[PDB]
Amino acid sequence: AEPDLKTALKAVIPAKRELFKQVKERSDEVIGEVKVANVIGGMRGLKSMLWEGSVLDPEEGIRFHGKTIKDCQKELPKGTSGTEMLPEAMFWLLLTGQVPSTNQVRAFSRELAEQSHLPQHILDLIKSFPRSMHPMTQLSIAVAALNTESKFAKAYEKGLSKADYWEPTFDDSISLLAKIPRVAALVFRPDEVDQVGTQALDASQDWSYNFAELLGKGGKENQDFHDLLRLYLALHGDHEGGNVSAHATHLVGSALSDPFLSYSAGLLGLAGPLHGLAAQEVLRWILAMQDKIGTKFTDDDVRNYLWDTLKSGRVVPGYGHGVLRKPDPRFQALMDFAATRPDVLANPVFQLVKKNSEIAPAVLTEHGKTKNPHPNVDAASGVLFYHYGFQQPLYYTVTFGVSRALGPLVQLIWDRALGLPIERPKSINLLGLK
Amino acid sequence: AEPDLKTALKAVIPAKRELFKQVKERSDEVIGEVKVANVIGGMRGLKSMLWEGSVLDPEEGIRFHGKTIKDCQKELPKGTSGTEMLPEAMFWLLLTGQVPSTNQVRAFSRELAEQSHLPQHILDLIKSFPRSMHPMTQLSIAVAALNTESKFAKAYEKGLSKADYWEPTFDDSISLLAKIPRVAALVFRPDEVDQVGTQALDASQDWSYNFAELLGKGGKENQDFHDLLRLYLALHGDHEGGNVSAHATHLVGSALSDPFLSYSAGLLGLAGPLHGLAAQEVLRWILAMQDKIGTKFTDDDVRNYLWDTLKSGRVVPGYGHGVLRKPDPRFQALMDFAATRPDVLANPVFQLVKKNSEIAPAVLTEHGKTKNPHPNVDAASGVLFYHYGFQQPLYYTVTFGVSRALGPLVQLIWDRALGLPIERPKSINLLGLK
Numbered sequence A, B: 001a002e003p004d005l006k007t008a009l010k011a012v013i014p015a016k017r018e019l020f021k022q023v024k025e026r027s028d029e030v031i032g033e034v035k036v037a038n039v040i041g042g043m044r045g046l047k048s049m050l051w052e053g054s055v056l057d058p059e060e061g062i063r064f065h066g067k068t069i070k071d072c073q074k075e076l077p078k079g080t081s082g083t084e085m086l087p088e089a090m091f092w093l094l095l096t097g098q099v100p101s102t103n104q105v106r107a108f109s110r111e112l113a114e115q116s117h118l119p120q121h122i123l124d125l126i127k128s129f130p131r132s133m134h135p136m137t138q139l140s141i142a143v144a145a146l147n148t149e150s151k152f153a154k155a156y157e158k159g160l161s162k163a164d165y166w167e168p169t170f171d172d173s174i175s176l177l178a179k180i181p182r183v184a185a186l187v188f189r190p191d192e193v194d195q196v197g198t199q200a201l202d203a204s205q206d207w208s209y210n211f212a213e214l215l216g217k218g219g220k221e222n223q224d225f226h227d228l229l230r231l232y233l234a235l236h237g238d239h240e241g242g243n244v245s246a247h248a249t250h251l252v253g254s255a256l257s258d259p260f261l262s263y264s265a266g267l268l269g270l271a272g273p274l275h276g277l278a279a280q281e282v283l284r285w286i287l288a289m290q291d292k293i294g295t296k297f298t299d300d301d302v303r304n305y306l307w308d309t310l311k312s313g314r315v316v317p318g319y320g321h322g323v324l325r326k327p328d329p330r331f332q333a334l335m336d337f338a339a340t341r342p343d344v345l346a347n348p349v350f351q352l353v354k355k356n357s358e359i360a361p362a363v364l365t366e367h368g369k370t371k372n373p374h375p376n377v378d379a380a381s382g383v384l385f386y387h388y389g390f391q392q393p394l395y396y397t398v399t400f401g402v403s404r405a406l407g408p409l410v411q412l413i414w415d416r417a418l419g420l421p422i423e424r425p426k427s428i429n430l431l432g433l434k
């Protein structure tokens, strides 16, 4: 058979180490400036961390190994059904720097199906959560609770050579990826943990398909949604190093905490309103707007709701970005998915999202606080799930949490392979700056 | 009755905001350079974050608002019994910039007693943990699980003004502080969850005293241990912004995740071997040396064990530091605690720690691989707990986790009070650095 992912990674490791050596010779090379703004403004614009799989252009948007989203949509393998790029193929790309063949991805999806099962204690833990516990809180906990299955933690404790750190990190990463949809499904379905937690996946099917099965949207009749999920999971997988979830995963990982604990920290970061919880917050905000402005509304009604939101000392969710100064191509990608489906375009909630994207940038510019008045991917993602029957926005960031495992787990594997050190910036007080 | 903590904070908030405004006017001022080393070396030496409560003097050691450890030991209030500075008084110092009066601290200790109780679901959750689950994994989870009691998360979800962020953040911080010893005690004592989890605390007693009671080390016969615990908790509270636990808390907090989720991320960073486990590693290392060299050993016996450790390509635990170039004043503080206790000084294990601190720096310098040959606080802390009957080193990072809530929760309160933005640097790949 064609080489598997671990083998494909191993071929690429020596070349990366040689490049690391070459970059390291120019350690002393000056590349930028640190100003007072960078210190007080959350490190904004400070090129200070290494991320390999993706680099974000402020104007262009994200590239994955120099490939655009449309490039990935074209080149990455599809599933047995549908037209959308598989997230697992994206993972393969992110890790190796190479587009996998369809056969390689089929083999890789099978492995992911095989490793989905959970230890009973994870089921008992999830069963202990009160119904009112926030879903991202539950997801974060369960992922950290899976550190009992960590080969890296156990192997680090025994004694481990630095050169081989990546292998247990890789094993744990693949393990977590396989499991996280099922865990996510348990969060979605608290009354059915015994069944959901043990039900067999379709071994022939891809990761997204299987996630949908666990969500109770399996089968041919749900194939449109499978394509959306594949697309969605692939788009959110990675978005360079500086975003809070990626960063947190790497920061905690750098102290040699294993991937279950590290990505759990990521998930906690992703649960923040300013980060991934915005997917949730966008749709709550859109539903509230709809409730106030009604079924037939003017442009001014939307303008007023936005301005009232801002004058309340609250943000407009789904607009602005730490780096992007243009509309997010991930956002456009989800709108283009909607563009070919008349039933999605006929959904009033989608239409409200569309209408808001033609008004909110002007209002945010008039307000004059933000660097980026344009929509981000969170503006569009919730409504699509809503359309396919996922109507509880408190759960939307959970699906993000499944996706966002992809990129950061890749970087952790590389972090360990290159022997990158603990992350430890220098802090300073206000009086020291004055 | 004198001003309470919240009121004392409120008096100092407007002065901090005015200073922030003044520093902000010089945003464009250049303070440093970014080199290739900073990107590949975990941002080492890069002045890139704000931390108010503490500044590490590289040669003189940590200072808390410009006060040295000895200054804090002298000026900060003690408990109803004992001679060691109270950690809650350190929290007061860190937050307000001022030494509290004894009365002020008594009132604050009463509040912490009153708020220590946990919801029943946290007891069920901890009861579900498998006996094999690592203690820092358990502590991290339970702290995140306490986000069901987050006033910040619930108030953010209802709609809240950015200007009003700090109060709910402060309320959650005090709430988490009250609870975290009890949670920690539950991790220590899995067979006593029903009793430990529900027992009423003496409101007239201090935080450390009550933590020791929950540990089963209450009462007059254990008064020396109460003082050790007080001292220890106060010293480990805060150590600038750049350390992984502090940083993670701030990073996740910056996305507007609540203090329970943010500090949980901290605790996950603390679980990393490179960050939190050194106290554990020191004691295991010392016990191995003792097993070989006995309790009646010469200086050469210790030298040989050190040299063997180094020639095996391993570190000597508790020596060296990322930033400090001198012996840690926290380390000196703990040795001086032993200086007035003849029973501690008579303990062969303590004596081995003492003898190793005379020998190891010379050996480490001769070896020549290490920049900082001097002892850090982790060198001394484990032995002291061991002497008072806590002889499972696997649990020593848990007690660190209780301490390390102090500094980062303070900074979060300040982060919200100042309206600091999300932490979001830019990343770059190796090919981009070439």
Ligand SMILES: CC(C)(COP(=O)(O)OP(=O)(O)OC[C@H]1O[C@@H](n2cnc3c(N)ncnc32)[C@H](O)[C@@H]1OP(=O)(O)O)[C@@H](O)C(=O)NCCC(=O)NCCS
Pocket: A044, A273, A274, A275, A276, A278, A314, A315, A316, A317, A318, A319, A320, A321, A322, A323, A364, A369, A370, A371, A372, A376, A377, A378, B162, B419, B421, B422, B424
């Ligand atoms: C994404 C976000 C956190 C970027 O943060 P940032 O890079 O620090 O933002 P800026 O540099 O543009 O911030 C400058 C000011 O504009 C405000 N601002 C930025 N985007 C905003 C938005 N969409 N709505 C309202 N205010 C916004 C900031 O809060 C800040 O105001 P303050 O100083 O009074 O607090 C920010 O756009 C925001 O919080 N709103 C978007 C919420 C969201 O969709 N999150 C997911 C982003 S992918």
Ligand SMILES: O=C([O-])CC(=O)C(=O)O
Pocket: A239, A242, A243, A244, A275, A321, A322, A323, A377, B424
């Ligand atoms: O990760 C995301 O989707 C958003 C992002 O890039 C950021 O927060 O900077």
Ligand SMILES: O=C([O-])CC(=O)C(=O)O
Pocket: B320, B321, B322, B323, B369, B370, B371, B372
């Ligand atoms: O702290 C570390 O392990 C790295 C370091 O600063 C040193 O080389 O001494």
